[PDB]
Paper text:
On the other hand, the CASTOR1 homodimer and the CASTOR1-CASTOR2 heterodimer function as a cytosolic arginine sensor, and negatively regulate mTORC1 activity by binding to and inhibiting GATOR2. In the absence of arginine, CASTOR1 binds to GATOR2 and inhibits mTORC1 signaling; whereas in the presence of arginine, CASTOR1 interacts with arginine and no longer associates with GATOR2.
By using the single-wavelength anomalous dispersion (SAD) method with a selenomethionine (SeMet) derivative, we determined the crystal structure of full-length human CATSOR1 in complex with arginine to 2.07 Å resolution, with the Rwork/Rfree factors being 19.00%/23.83%. Dimerization buries ~935 Å2 of surface area for each protomer, and is mainly mediated through juxtaposition of the α1 and α5 helices of CASTOR1. ACT1 (residues 1–75) and ACT2 (residues 76–153) assemble into the N-terminal domain (NTD, residues 1–153), while ACT3 (residues 175–260) and ACT4 (residues 261–329) form the C-terminal domain (CTD, residues 175–329). The NTD and CTD are reminiscent of two halves of a sphere, and the bound arginine molecule is encased inside this sphere. The arginine molecule is completely buried inside CASTOR1, and is located at the interface between CASTOR1-NTD and -CTD.
Author numbering:
A (entry chain A): -7 to 158, 173 to 209, 222 to 257, 260 to 324
B (entry chain C): -8 to 159, 172 to 208, 222 to 257, 260 to 324, 401
Amino acid sequence: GLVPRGSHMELHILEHRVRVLSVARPGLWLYTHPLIKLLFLPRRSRCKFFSLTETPEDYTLMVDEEGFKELPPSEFLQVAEATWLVLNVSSHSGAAVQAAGVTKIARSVIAPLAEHHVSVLMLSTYQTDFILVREQDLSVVIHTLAQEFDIYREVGGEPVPVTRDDTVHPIQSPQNRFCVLTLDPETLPAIATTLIDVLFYSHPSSITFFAFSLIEGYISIVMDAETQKKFPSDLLLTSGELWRMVRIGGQPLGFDECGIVAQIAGPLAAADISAYYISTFNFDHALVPEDGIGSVIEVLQRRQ
Amino acid sequence: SGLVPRGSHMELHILEHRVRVLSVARPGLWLYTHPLIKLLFLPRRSRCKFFSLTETPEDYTLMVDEEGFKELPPSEFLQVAEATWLVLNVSSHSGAAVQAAGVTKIARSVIAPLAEHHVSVLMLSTYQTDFILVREQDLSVVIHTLAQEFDIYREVGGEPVPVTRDDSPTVHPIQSPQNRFCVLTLDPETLPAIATTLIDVLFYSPSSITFFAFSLIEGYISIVMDAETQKKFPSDLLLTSGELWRMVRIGGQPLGFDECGIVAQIAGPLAAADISAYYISTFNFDHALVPEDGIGSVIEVLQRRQR
Ligand SMILES: NC(=[NH2+])NCCC[C@H](N)C(=O)O
Ligand SMILES: [Mg+2]
């Protein structure tokens, strides 16, 4: 709520240079060796950005350049053309804002990027909301957001100020209840065998969705409450806040079309609903608090 | 030392497993991480009941039953021995398991006679028991050879069934690396705790040798690892000890699968000297593990002679 008059939030362009990939489910097995390394043995990779998400269609992978080098090319692997940069928002301090804050940046970030034809990919995590943009759009990004945000670019691990350089998609709601969880990285070994089983060895009203990310040492997991029961239940949160999913799109969305996240986040913000938002290679996914799910579906139906 | 009835016979069990013997080149191991993780750690997901992986300087040798073999994609990196192998195990009269590290205790009764009849063997000693692999087509010669001293049973749907009248060259060089080896087991329910360090050791990268063995056969785990590799683990690897083992590597060039008498010319002299041994055959070479303090005596005994 209350803030000083002259004050501006901060937009951080992080160091990461990210490739976005799809691995066909039948080929996943081929990538077990490099993925296990990136998940469980980061003492052996220079990777600092790793996102893996299971959908019905594929496994989408978002990996920094160092992580990308570990992946052998194959006909099972589709690679998005562009290299992507990672945006994050924080308060004037450089202090993290609440998670599930995608709707809080609908008007200030998401709609203005779409208005300037800047395609985004979202990656909400337990800790924060990341927005990925292609390299090519960076100058338009700065143009778009310098008015309201103090923009900082990560150069040698430090935040540095920049100056000049530096249509309506169908929705589904499956019935799964989702948890958004974290875990101490020191606890990863104890969970490793059941995590490997879930990710690598697993065969309309329900959807298969499982998200695991390790970003700068921070672990984020989204899983089915049913899938949670497979683990010791020594995964962390503050709660049982369970979440319901809305999946966005009819056919595969590209990396070119703008305004998708804007259609979802704008109406949801106008209704004061929180959301995590996760983009995969083909589709978008919003996670809204379970008790507000009918109201979400209502609000989204109102867009023309 | 014990006593038994004069007219009693130890039992020879031909187990249910049908085994394939494979070599994976070190540069291609990564391709096999998915099915091997499954066979090691998620045995519920496969019908495999016999799995053995040993790392050497040359390769990774895999011994697996037909059901595990199914899970392994062909590639340039994978060599398969032609034959299907059957698995023999000795027990006492009345079906009881025999002490481990007992290759020398069967040198005279099993090993020498099989070599005398040109039955080529592969040895797999584990923490639990000594397995002797023979090719399927030799089975009737095996029976002829061992029927005299042993009551022979074929395992059929997990039950031992008595067998009736056949029923359903060169002296090799030796080197002992300086490595000290332990033979370990694990409670299967504690594999998860160890999974990432074990994965890291297997899948992620002369006076000493690289040798590591892991087997999971009928729910039982067996591991052989270097004393220094042991330091990378939480120290609930179970043994009876500080009795470490020294390795004698046997052969000067790859030994293949046809030559008989190799295990015999090693286990024979050691039985005469009353020194105990584990014995493990890999795709290229044979390996005896002997008590560390007896190594000089072993080398002595072995240089005296004229798989
Ligand atoms: N492959 C995708 N997930 N595409 C949709 C992502 C969001 C879209 N680029 C936008 O700017 O609104
Ligand atoms: Mg004879």
